[model samples]
Target: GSPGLPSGWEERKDAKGRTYYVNHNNRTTTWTRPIM
Candidate 1:
C-alpha cells in the first residue's frame, strides 16, 4: 500500500529524467519509475 504524500511530490522527474518518490518531509527517496 502507498502512504499519503503531498501533491507535486510524486511523478517527479529530475533534470536527468530519472523518476523517483520523495519522502513527505522532502527528504530521501525510493526508485520506482519507468526508465527514461
Candidate 2:
C-alpha cells in the first residue's frame, strides 16, 4: 500500500486529529493508514 499524505490533507481530519486512509487500493493493497 502506498501510504502518503491524504490528497486533501488540509480539509481532512479524524476526531483524533489525524488523517484517514482513503482506500487507495488494488487487490494487493491493504494496511492501516498511519502505520503502514
Candidate 3:
C-alpha cells in the first residue's frame, strides 16, 4: 500500500518519457536527480 509515499512515488516520468521507474528506497542504493 502506498500510504506515505512521495509525489513521484509508484510512478515517475523522465526526459525520455520512460514509463517504468527504479525504486530503491535505501539512501545507500539511490542517488539524487541530475540537473539538465
Candidate 4:
C-alpha cells in the first residue's frame, strides 16, 4: 500500500510504469501523490 494516500484513495501504475493516485470517492486520478 501507498504511504501517503488518504482514505478511499489508492495507488496505481500506468502502462508506462509511472505512479499515480486514484480517488475512489471522487472518481478522479492524479499523477502526484495526494496529501489528503
Q: Is 2 or 4 the stronger prediction by TM-score?
A: 4
Candidate 4: clashing residue pairs, number: 0
Would you give me the overall lDDT of model 2? 0.41
Tens-digit per-residue lDDT, 1-36, candidate 3: 423444434435576776433354432222334121
Model 4 per-residue lDDT tens digits across residues 1-36: 757688888888887989888899888898877877
CA shift of 12, model 2, Å? 5.4
lDDT, candidate 3, at 23: 51
Backbone clashes for every candidate come to 0, 0, 0, 0
RMSD of each: 7.7, 7.4, 9.9, 1.1
Q: Any idea what lDDT model 3 has?
A: 0.39
- lDDT (Cα atoms) of all candidates against the true structure: 0.55, 0.41, 0.39, 0.83
Of candidate 2, the 10-residue stretch with the lowest lDDT total is 27-36
Give per-residue CA lDDT, model 1, range 1-36, as digits (tens). Answer: 244545535555587977667655555575763222
Model 2 misplaced regions, further than 4 Å: 1-12, 24-36
Q: List the residue pairs that clash in candidate 2.
A: none
Name the runs in model 4 displaced over 4 angstroms: none
Q: Cα deviation in Å at residue 18, candidate 1?
A: 0.7
